[PDB]
């Protein structure tokens, strides 16, 4: 049987296979022991560890019993049929590029708010999660930090998912603006250029769950994010929220400018929308969570590590079409010239990279360059591209 | 042997295979009898037709003798190992979208020069050539017309190929401008935004074959185009050249603006460069030739139907990175929002589409919309995308 | 004596002069019987009318007694030594131009707020007050209406008067912007272009009476206006204030944009400043009052009909230097091309004209042209200039 | 008689008046012995000096005979009825401000052409000519230099004089642009913003003497200038012309941009117009000549020191209306904020100031500030204004 073949493959001319050997073999591929799809499996393993004082041998019966629950993924993992059969070498490349980026330095930690002028210019972490389930971490992959501007794609995806492409783009545009992200101006028919610049994001946040009050909207968006992050750590930075809402005069200017030109749906309180925008900008994340959200955007709109649907394919396709052409603002043309990937960046450090049909990635470094892009993150991106050949127009 | 297997496959329980049957079978796949790689083959067939008064039977020997010369491609063609195993159904889809675009109409034939105000608003043709050798035509696929603006990618590719990415982009920029293609303004460090807008193309044409006189430059570029078109019809529209050079005040303004800011290499005659630019804009093409050039840009920088190298991979990669983000100018964001492909358009009708690693395409229709894009061409592009799922961020 | 000479001049070979004859003669010149400088005089006349049942004759004594109080102005008025010796003919010209402007029509009454979409497109009034004391009215010269944008020069004058030119212009610029009045952008060193565009006025309103709360600021500015209007009707349009503060999204956008770039003094509440700005924009006026304020701006910074000082000469000079070059916004160049005068215009109808060293004028008409300038007001201005030769560069 | 009264006034209780005493007395007022209106007079004086070996006494007859010819101006000059009765004190003020400006220094002599990178950064001269005939000089008031940009008002005046305001302004605009003088962009209805920016001047030079060839146009304009300069030194800088025509890429860009949008009259050769523009820009002048041309612009369109008519009043009025609002380009708002006068400036050093109804002035200094305005010239202008109170909105 297939289970017997798997048992023989795990073993090497032996009778019994210890549990720890199987756990190490499973973790070798890239999947984590905490994977929800494997939950039942591990539970049974615990039921096996409750009897023996130390160690247990699984020859024929117990192994089959533990592997019986949802025996689909294990066959693929041990048969190397995922999108990246070898994750151990790509991980080594992550480590090499990580050290290489660490060697460089020199920027200016954002100080427009005190909570941002609080991180030492030394935190530098990376996390990656494949569309299939593999995950890797290196460094500060559990420290908290605000998403800041990494959430705008997530706003757009949800809005067009709820309403659909046609209704939404009656309100925001479709084109790169060619200028900075915080510039006050609209396209030819007095509409936001795209939902990645701040004005487009401010108009977009007003299409989500219209009518109900901000508490219900935040509950809705947090629910969507939690099933986007795959039930990972998505939090709230109340200190950062309080700082941002007081140092966000540019966003208030953009919001009133939009409201004046009738860029909003019928019957909207603009100020509540701005407060909601700041709330979403103030969602704390760890490179693990932001990487998982990236992979969700990358996969199909589904979540990678839960086998779940979160967005309609049109929403995700449009979000990537907008991230590739506006993800890095007026620098995007250069980024896609060298990197050729959809990516987003937050002033609080952090780059969210999507390799469509491959993986998602988040890499965090507080100190900023003059553009607003973490030096080590940009360096990691360029080196990753040079060594892995991930440009969208590579051969 | 392999030849015997091919002969049996062609035959149906018979002894001899007539020549016409084999010719029809070969043309069925998509390859043309005039393919250079098959030249020798067809020559031998003619040597076979010089003996018999009418018809000849090839059982074992003559078929093997004719197929011996370069027996690599035939095995793939009869084994359906190309990039599009079935070209007969895609051709039917081309026909359907062709008729659908023909049904629509309504524009304004360009009249800024008389030679353009000379085509009846009824010519509507399409041609496609796969990276492997397949070709299809429908309609006015041999009438002449000027490339106009479809040549700017071809200028950039050649320039960076001769000099390399690093030296060239010291002169032109890398970003979408966000405005029309004929606007006079440069990027932050007083450099052209990109080589697709007119200013970037005018600066780029001055990097090709520096020093020598315009006659030698035109011979050089025509040589490159001829081995880009695959030795197809690349001509010159002397009447159109004379009209354009007299109705090109915008390009002269851009050229002098560039020369003033020191956007040119050392020691360049600007006016000669502008005349050279108009000469390249005045290169006559038929949807066959422009399609072949598109497929060259699509393949690797190699020519599809000659197995030849014309450009370095860096040149082609950069040219596609610039066509996807500036190929349709300030409308490109919308085009890549719906079509998701590198494409270029000329005021003389004609859209050049590249499906990287798949094919190139040229579709010609004189009458223009307000943007400057042929109505039927734009409609064909959108319908092609909707029915074939060729968007770069499709699943 | 001088009084005897005046009495003989008033009389025509007679002994006694009736009071009504003298009153008519005085009103003929242009001065009003309610002039504060003449107050005492008229009071004595009333004391003379309390004795006789009807009519009283003033031969030598009573006339001298009544004229004794401040006998300076009367000598000039009866000696024709004012700036316009004949005010009866200029008044006829006002009437002619008034009817001529009335004949034309056709606009669009402002409807962005209901209080403005409340005047019938038929109100058309004019008032003029000379720097010396003469006043003329024609039509709706006592109906109320909001100043709207006619107050910005008055804000700038007061600000620079309190602080001085040097300190103030450290905050706002000095140049025409060349664009509309409600555009969001600053000059080269991120400062407002000038205090006439909305952004400059919003920054300027924050320099007046810094520190204290909005109630004290409004009391201060109303005091200044009342001694600017010459203790005429300066009111408040609470209904219009409530409408404006709810339909002023453009001004809120400008205000937040200014606050973001650090265009404000140290320690300012921006929102309170915006509310104060709307309060000043909502000050009701009648062509009499706005004309008197214009004449104040025209005279020296002094009030015309009270012999009082309200502004330092530097403040007034700078205010006129800014009204001539930015008073009508991006149309000002054309206005000064044909009219050659400092002028301001409000969306609520009303044009405030200053003929420096000559007079001030206010002309009210609700319906607007596409620019934002009342049709009849613009027509009156152009005709006034054509017939009176008041262009600043006339001979 | 009047002549006897003048003779007695010149004398001091004496019988005879020597010629040299009268010449000194005449030169004291400010008029020059070379004044054309006095020509005949001086001729007779020479006829008087041909008889006596040395010195001649004029008691009654010879003085009357010499003064008989056109005895109008002398009465005014000796009766102090000109516009500036005392020219000796204003001259002292010129000297004081001249030294004060000389004390400052520091710029960058223009080096875009070698002929401009040829003057030592030490030449500093001033000349003034009153509307009535007075003239004063201080320093390099006879060295040659090119007008450069001081000619654009002179082009506009002549164009609108020949054709009239209405026809001309169908081609150029009326508004300040708010940007630099060499920017490529047009107003709302695709027309030049005004005839002071380079584009407006290039369109304006094509309205003068249409149809005929460039030689006839240059003869026409030189004739007009010569009767504008009052038959003073107006020359041509052939070396500077040859340098400019080769370093004028910005003007060529502007010219082609204009021709493209149909901003020219019917049937014009654009390149000939550009060559004509450079020719007019290359007209050599000495502070004497440019001052005389300024005074012509200041007087009425008439020439000051010839009693001649050169321009229609509408032309001059419009030229001043455009110089006050666009004379110093994007700095004009600040200039009129502090100086309040029509003024023009050339990159070759030289400021041309008009005090309407008072005088014209030219002050030359090669080295430039960053704006393009000679440091010493700007300093002289500001100090002149501060000490003389010539601001247009002064009291």
Residue numbers in the entry:
A (entry chain A), B (entry chain C), C (entry chain D), D (entry chain B): 138 to 532
Question: Would you copy out the relevant sentences from the publication that reported this structure?
Answer:
Glutaminase catalyzes the first step of glutamine metabolism, converting glutamine to glutamate, which enters the tricarboxylic acid cycle. In human, glutaminase is encoded by two different genes, GLS1 and GLS2.1 GLS1 can be alternatively spliced into kidney glutaminase A (KGA) and highly active glutaminase isoform C (GAC)1. Glutaminase, especially the GAC isoform, is highly overexpressed in various cancers for the utilization of glutamine. GAC can be further activated by anions. It has been observed that GAC can form active filaments both in vitro and in vivo.
Cryo-EM samples of GAC containing Pi and an analog of glutamine, 6-Diazo-5-oxo-L-norleucine (DON) were prepared. We resolved the structure of GAC filament at a resolution of 2.9 Å. GAC forms filaments with tetramers as the helical unit. By viewing the filament from the top, the twist angle of ~51° can be observed. A GAC tetramer contains four Pi binding sites, which are located on the dimer–dimer interface, consisting of R317 and K320 on the activation loop (AL), as well as R387, Y394′ and K398′ on the dimer–dimer interface. Significant conformational changes were observed in the GAC tetramer bound with Pi when comparing the tetramers in filament to free tetramers, and the RMSD between them is greater than 2 Å. First, the GAC-PF tetramer changes into a compressed form, with each protomer rotating by 5.6°. Second, the AL (residues 308–334) of each protomer in the GAC-PF tetramer is reshaped and stabilized. However, in the GAC-PF tetramer, the B-factor analysis of our models shows that the AL is in a stable state. However, when Pi-bound GAC forms a filament, the AL is stabilized, and the pocket is remodeled, resulting in highly active GAC.
